[PDB]
Amino acid sequence: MQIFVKTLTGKTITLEVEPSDTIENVKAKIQDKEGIPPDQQALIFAGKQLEDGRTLSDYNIQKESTLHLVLRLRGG
């Protein structure tokens, strides 16, 4: 199974993973393929934020679903 996480810059990252993968692991893959640390990673699907520790199967994220990644940092 492969999914596509699009970002605000327009880049579309593709990650082929299995539903047992956790979003923490998805954040790790997004790091390896692009270099974006998971502490800057905000993952959205169908207007719902994904919380770390739960897996894709908990969020009904399925075949070729597209999640969205935005960088979310503290100020200063």
Binding site: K6, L8, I44, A46, G47, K48, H68, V70, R74, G75
Partner: protein, 819 residues
């Protein structure tokens, strides 16, 4: 009335391309004819065709735009508009149809070879039609498969352009193209009053009088926008009225109204009708609101030499030669005509900043600081502060009646530091997202282990902001409670919201350095029912928000805005916004988007987090109490990922005392006043001590000792001393303590023997008794001083206080008589 799709003359590419083509191929080329073929120069740039060139054409297009707009509004206001043969009114123009109309309007004048009026009209329109068809053919590929349905459509609009049979009212195309051209004539007339009345009479049936005022007002603003001269208007002008249909005159008044050609010289003591006389006629007033009114020519704030030095500026030639520039000018003017009526309908405000704090906000701030200072006051059901219980309703009342941003301005960095201790106190407090599927999260533990990052107070502020921004289990509940739309919230959730909203506002205010943006985008996922309510309210407001020339409809705009205001949807909490509409539209898939325009800097947005590429570019708005988000436009923007319809409400922030809410003071001051109430524990112990029963048992024990020693004793002066100096003071003392008589008590003190009178005898029992005689002496001295000196002085003090004699009240305690 259908919802618009956001089609604008100033954004649609096809119309701009057609205008480029027209300029490019006709309007920018010189007249091959005679009349006024001589070019004109503006600030060094040449305009070849000045009266019937690009700026004129673009203005005709803009006219059709606002004519359709104002017709739509008039239909929404319930006005009966003139119908075409098929029953359709001008409101019924679709965006596709309007695009076709405007595209045609681009070429309506291309076929002109000069300025000649009357002769050679037909030929110039033939040439215009040919130019149009040429354009269509050259790009036939693009648009016949798109914009025109087929060649029958193209022949339709070409047939309007040609104007073979002067059928100027067969369709919307004919009215818009021909009357849009007619409107632009309001520049070179003699004199303005007769012509303006005529064109007004021409347009009025189709869209209505209110709409027609809007059109010509907006037209003057387009003139200013395109550096065309703007005439005055004097209903008391004495120049003779000219009948526009036939360039004739009326004479006095001779009716059959009797038409007169100009050249018909007539009778002695007979004269042409004056323009003011024309404007005072009943039939004219019934259809033209210009009676009695005057309009100033030129620009307010510019004298004729500055205004004139503006009309010859290069921007006139940029308008006549730069499609993108003239379209930008008209776009900014068109936008401004959507705002000026709104600010015109309400009282103005000179200050742009939040008001000063009021008493209840000040008290609220104090109560927040005290809660933050001592979280032990937090029990699962209530807050217990200084003997006062504040329940959920108190904190909801704070959230609903206080400007929590102002409260935050009244907090300090010590309260920020106390955030951490508060989170320690709530280490294990369950926080529930509004997503009932998501798990509960431990408040303080999540704070300590994942949000908080050490550092100084500023870093605590950025941590709190990061909390509000990142953790939906927090900000969903917090936002929902602040807007009084929460379901099944715990008291500690309401409390945490009530303390965290002002603290977050202080965090934002203190930490935000960006210059305030003037266009923010807010995403909402609303029910179809609620969104439709908002659509109806907005479209109502827009329909009753119009420009004017003579008839000021501000009162109705006021009325409808206050009836249909939905500013509270963005009020009461730290509402999240972004400068990138793709954050609410694309990332979160919201079906509702607020394009919030703050051109006057009234919203005070604070930056949230970082604004790196790929960030949410988030700013936070805490709506001020006197700022309204007034809709100027509602657009259908397509469908979301879930296939729901998405609309964009464009809202303009307007500040006014009229939007201030009426609240009743005291909701917060009261509890604070209760908290300053003393317990006065020391006084409670004073009265409990003044209620102690005397220890007569000790007095009897001492009487027994004196008895058994004075009945049996070989000493003479110890027995006489005991039976004569000690036993009397014991009997009297016992009686004084039993009867409480302070007179006997005061003087028995002098009756006690001295330590020297006891010291004459070194017996064991003499000392053992002297200790007890001294203990009783202390007893009666204590009692006779309270009842004899203190308590009466306290009565005098209190009585002197309920009488408001403070100086005598202090005399009561200072002036204590001795015994």
């Amino acid at each position: 009335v259908p919802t618009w799709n956001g089609f604008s003359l100033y954004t649609d590419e096809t119309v701009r391309n057609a205008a480029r083509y027209a300029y490019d191929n006709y309007l920018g080329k010189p007249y091959t004819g005679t009349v006024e073929a001589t070019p004109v120069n503006f600030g060094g740039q040449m305009v070849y065709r000045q009266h019937h060139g690009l700026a004129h054409t673009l203005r005709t297009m803009a006219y059709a735009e606002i004519i359709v707009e104002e017709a739509r509004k008039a239909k929404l206001r319930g006005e009966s508009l003139k119908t075409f043969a098929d029953g359709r009114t001008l409101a019924d123009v679709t965006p596709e149809e309007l695009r076709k109309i405007m595209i045609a309007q681009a070429f309506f004048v291309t076929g002109r070879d000069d300025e000649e009026s009357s002769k050679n009209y037909e030929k110039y329109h033939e040439q215009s039609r040919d130019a149009f068809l040429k354009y269509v053919e050259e790009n036939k590929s693009t648009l016949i498969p798109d914009v025109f349905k087929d060649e029958k459509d193209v022949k339709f609009y070409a047939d309007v352009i040609e104007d073979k049979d002067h059928k100027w009212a067969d369709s919307p195309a004919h009215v818009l193209v021909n009357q849009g051209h007619m409107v632009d004539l309001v520049r070179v007339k003699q004199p303005p009053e007769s012509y303006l009345e005529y064109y007004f009479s021409q347009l009025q049936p189709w869209i209505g009088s209110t709409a027609t005022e809007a059109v010509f007002a907006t037209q003057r603003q387009f003139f200013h926008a395109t550096y065309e001269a703007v005439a005055g208007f004097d209903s008391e002008n004495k120049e003779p009225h000219l009948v526009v249909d036939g360039l004739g005159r009326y004479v006095i008044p001779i009716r059959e109204l009797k038409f007169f050609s100009q050249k018909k010289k007539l009778e002695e003591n007979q004269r042409y009708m004056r323009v003011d006389e024309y404007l005072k006629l009943d039939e004219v007033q019934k259809r033209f609101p210009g009676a009695g009114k005057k309009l100033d020519g030129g620009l307010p704030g510019l004298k004729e030499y500055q205004y004139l030095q503006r009309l010859n500026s290069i921007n006139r030639a940029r308008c006549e030669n730069d499609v993108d520039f003239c379209l930008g000018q008209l776009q900014t003017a068109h936008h401004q005509t959507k705002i000026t009526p709104i600010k015109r309908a309400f009282q103005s405000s000179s200050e742009k900043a939040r008001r000063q704090p009021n008493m209840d906000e000040i008290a609220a701030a104090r109560i927040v600081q005290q809660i933050m200072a001592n979280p032990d006051c937090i029990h699962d059901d209530h807050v217990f502060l200084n003997g006062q219980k504040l329940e959920e309703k108190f904190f909801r009342d704070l959230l609903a009646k206080c400007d929590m941003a102002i409260v935050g301005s009244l907090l300090n960095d010590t309260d920020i530091r106390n955030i951490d201790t508060l989170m320690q106190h709530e280490r294990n407090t369950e926080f529930h997202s509004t997503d009932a599927k998501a798990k509960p999260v431990k408040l303080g533990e999540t704070w300590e282990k994942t949000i908080r990052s050490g550092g100084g107070v500023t870093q605590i502020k950025h941590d709190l902001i990061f909390l509000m921004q990142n953790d939906a289990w927090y900000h969903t509940r917090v936002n929902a409670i602040a807007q009084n739309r929460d379901k099944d919230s715990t008291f500690k959730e309401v409390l945490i919201t009530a303390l965290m909203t002002p603290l977050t506002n202080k965090s934002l205010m203190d930490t935000s350095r960006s210059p305030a943006p003037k266009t923010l985008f807010r995403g909402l996922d609303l029910s179809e029912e609620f969104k439709n309510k908002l659509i109806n309210q907005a479209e109502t407001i827009i329909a009753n928000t119009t420009e004017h020339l003579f008839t000021d409809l501000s009162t109705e705009a006021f009325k409808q805005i206050k009836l249909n205001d939905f500013s509270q949807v963005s009020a009461r909490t730290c509402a999240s916004t972004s400068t990138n509409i793709e954050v609410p539209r694309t990332i979160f898939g919201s079906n509702t988007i607020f394009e919030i325009l703050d051109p006057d800097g009234l919203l005070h947005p604070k930056q949230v987090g970082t604004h790196v590429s790929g960030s949410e570019s988030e700013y936070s708005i805490y709506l001020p109490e006197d700022v309204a988000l007034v809709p100027i436009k509602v657009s259908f923007d397509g469908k979301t990922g879930k296939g729901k319809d998405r609309h964009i409400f464009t809202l303009v922030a307007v500040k006014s005392p009229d939007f201030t809410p009426r609240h009743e003071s005291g909701y917060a001051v009261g509890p604070l006043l209760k908290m300053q109430t003393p317990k006065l524990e020391e006084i409670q112990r004073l009265v409990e001590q003044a209620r102690e029963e005397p220890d007569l048992e000790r007095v009897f024990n001492l009487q027994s000792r004196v008895a058994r020693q004075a009945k049996f004793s070989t000493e003479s002066g110890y027995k006489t001393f005991l039976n004569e100096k000690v036993a009397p003071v014991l009997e009297q003392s016992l009686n004084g303590l039993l009867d409480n008589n302070v007179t006997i008590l005061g003087k028995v003190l002098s009756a006690f023997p001295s330590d020297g009178q006891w010291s004459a005898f070194n017996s064991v029992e003499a000392r053992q008794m002297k200790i007890q005689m001294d203990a009783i002496k202390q007893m009666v001295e204590k009692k006779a001083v309270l009842e004899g000196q203190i308590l009466p002085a306290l009565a005098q003090c209190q009585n002197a206080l309920e009488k408001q004699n403070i100086a005598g009240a202090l005399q009561a305690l200072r002036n204590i008589p001795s015994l």
